[PDB]
């Protein structure tokens, strides 16, 4: 219960909350990569059609 | 059009011997969302 472990647990809350924010940032950005790519695929089918 | 219409970009997959052995299609539908 020293503030060496209190600042350790403060780093536990800070870094884990930032990594769950970054993991959702990977999720949304990689989703948008598919969002434009399926519009490229639909643009391909529409334009050769 | 009067009534129900679908929108592009919404999750609408499908629903309901050899034709109901295709229960696995729902399985990779839920797998694709995870």
């Amino acid at each position: 219960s020293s503030p060496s472990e209190e600042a350790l647990l403060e780093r536990r809350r800070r870094i884990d909350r930032e990594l769950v924010e970054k993991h959702r940032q990977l999720g949304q950005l990689h989703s948008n990569f598919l969002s434009v790519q399926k519009r490229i695929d639909e643009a391909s089918k529409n334009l050769v059609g | 059009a009067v009534g129900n219409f679908s929108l592009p970009g919404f999750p609408l997959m499908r629903g309901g011997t050899r034709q109901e052995e295709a229960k696995k299609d729902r399985s990779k539908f839920l797998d694709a969302a995870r």
Partner: protein, 100 residues
């Protein structure tokens, strides 16, 4: 060795033209798995948005000179059949099929 030189010309000529890898086709299939109402991407793999490139003008001409080198290999030994170790009958069909 002339067939090997024209081979190395053919391999680099395709490398200059280049292809796209398409490593994400399974996952665009997973996006169309739930958005589109079609049952098509269920049992079928999602194809390429743009296909592979074309055999070009001189890149096809390099195939023609590879054909001329392999056929001249076939017929120089045919007119020099005095030595029996010149293009055994198994290779007689083999170089003649794949040259032409």
């Amino acid at each position: 060795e002339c067939a090997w030189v024209l081979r190395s010309a053919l391999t680099v000529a395709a490398a200059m033209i280049g292809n796209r890898n398409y490593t994400d086709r399974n996952e665009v299939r997973k996006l169309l798995m739930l958005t589109s109402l079609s049952l098509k991407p269920f049992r079928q793999q999602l194809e390429a948005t743009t296909p592979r490139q074309v055999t070009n003008l001189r890149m096809a001409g390099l195939l023609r000179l590879l054909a001329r080198a392999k056929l001249l290999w076939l017929l120089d030994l045919d007119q020099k059949r005095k030595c029996p170790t010149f293009s055994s009958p198994g290779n007689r069909s083999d170089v003649a099929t794949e040259a032409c």
